[PDB]
Write a protein that binds this DNA or RNA. Structure first.
Length: 57
DNA sequence: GTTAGGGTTAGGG
DNA sequence: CCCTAACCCTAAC
């Protein structure tokens, strides 16, 4: 079962989540907007890798 | 349960 | 063996 690579549905939705409900508020983001099967851990570590190299918030 | 960084597994090069 | 990245662990909140 090949590991799922995040798509813009998830990532673009996440970016919206960060802007509309704050970055470090993955709970709120998960409540407001749905994803395939993500957690606070997933969302945060995704955004972590992203900002670490690209620097967005 | 969530949050936050450390760190391994998966993926591709 | 390196980079980016999804998963997984340790630690703290």
């Amino acid at each position: 079962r090949k590991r799922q690579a995040w798509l813009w549905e998830e990532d673009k939705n996440l970016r919206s989540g960060v802007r509309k409900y704050g970055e470090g508020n993955w709970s709120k983001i998960l409540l407001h907007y749905k994803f395939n099967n993500r957690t606070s851990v997933m969302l945060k570590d995704r955004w972590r890798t992203m900002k670490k190299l690209k620097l967005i918030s």
